[PDB]
């Protein structure tokens, strides 16, 4: 049945009824109910009742949402109890949507559920909802989630959003794309790096070293690259780089030899 009162926590319940003025009257109740070592289903009720009065209190929400995650932790993440936790974060965010920790905890819970398709969507909401100055807390989770999985097409689109606010991460984007065999996209981003005239990147590479990594990448992968006139860029290195002309003529031939275009290899 839906009704039932103890003999032992009635003073805390009656105290709240006469003193509806502070969270402390509920905290004394909630703190008491835990010392009893009481059932989790009763704790959810007292928290949701307290959060009906004090719906903007971050403390009770953060404690309640973490208490749900605590007692459900022994259940498999496929279980519907983890789905019910996410629906509780939605109700929390309907007040505390400007608090980053709730968004971060919501996103971590979606990762623990292992779903992908709308975990990305929860992240997209967090970016729209939080101040831009808070977004670095989100992006390091958002990218970390995506780069933990074999999700090349999604991660590409999310990264070129991310690099509009943190362009210094483009070096790490290149390293991701190479590991995911996105060689043509990796070479596109390297050219974007080489088109920046800063003397060195945050990974300690100068423009000549970044351009050498492009010539490396572009000559040794003839079959995998399509957007770049590989011959044109390497001849743009025989131009200007007068101290390595003999190397770059062989590097251009090496590209054609790996393409098995031996006729044009002899032309070079």
């Amino acid at each position: 049945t839906m009704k039932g009162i103890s003999s032992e926590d009635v003073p805390f319940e009656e105290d709240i009824i006469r003193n509806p003025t502070s969270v402390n009257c509920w905290q004394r109740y909630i703190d008491h109910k835990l010392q009893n070592k009481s059932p989790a289903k009763q704790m959810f009720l007292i928290y949701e009742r307290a959060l009906a009065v004090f719906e903007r209190s971050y403390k009770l929400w953060y404690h309640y949402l973490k208490y749900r995650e605590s007692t459900i932790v022994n259940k498999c993440p496929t279980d519907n109890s983890w789905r019910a936790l996410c629906d509780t974060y939605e109700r929390c965010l309907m007040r505390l949507h400007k608090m980053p920790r709730i968004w971060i905890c919501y996103c971590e819970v979606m990762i623990k559920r292992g779903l992908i398709t709308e975990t990305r969507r929860v992240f997209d909401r967090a970016l729209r909802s939080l101040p831009v100055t808070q977004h670095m807390r989100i992006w390091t989770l958002y990218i970390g989630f995506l780069t933990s999985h074999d999700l090349p097409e999604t991660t590409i689109r999310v990264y070129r959003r991310y690099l509009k606010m943190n362009p210094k991460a483009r070096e790490d984007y290149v390293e991701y794309l190479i590991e995911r065999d996105q060689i043509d996209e990796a070479a596109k981003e390297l050219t974007t790096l080489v088109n920046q005239d800063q003397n060195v990147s945050e990974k300690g590479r100068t423009a000549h070293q970044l351009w050498t990594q492009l010539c490396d990448l572009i000559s040794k992968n003839p079959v995998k690259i399509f957007s770049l006139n590989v011959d044109a860029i390497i001849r743009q290195g025989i131009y200007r780089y007068t101290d390595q002309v003999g190397f770059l003529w062989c590097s251009l031939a090496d590209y054609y030899i790996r393409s098995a275009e031996f006729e044009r290899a002899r032309d070079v």
């Binding site: 003999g246 190397f247 062989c250 031939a253 090496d254 030899i257 790996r258 393409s259 098995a260 031996f262």
Partner: peptide, 28 residues
């Protein structure tokens, strides 16, 4: 670079001619 450029165009032949043989068979 004298040793770099020769030996790295030697494997380039190896990777290249291994692929050439695959192409010459698939044409059949």
């Amino acid at each position: 670079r004298r040793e770099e450029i020769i030996n790295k165009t030697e494997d380039a032949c190896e990777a290249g001619f291994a692929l050439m043989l695959e192409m010459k068979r698939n044409s059949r």
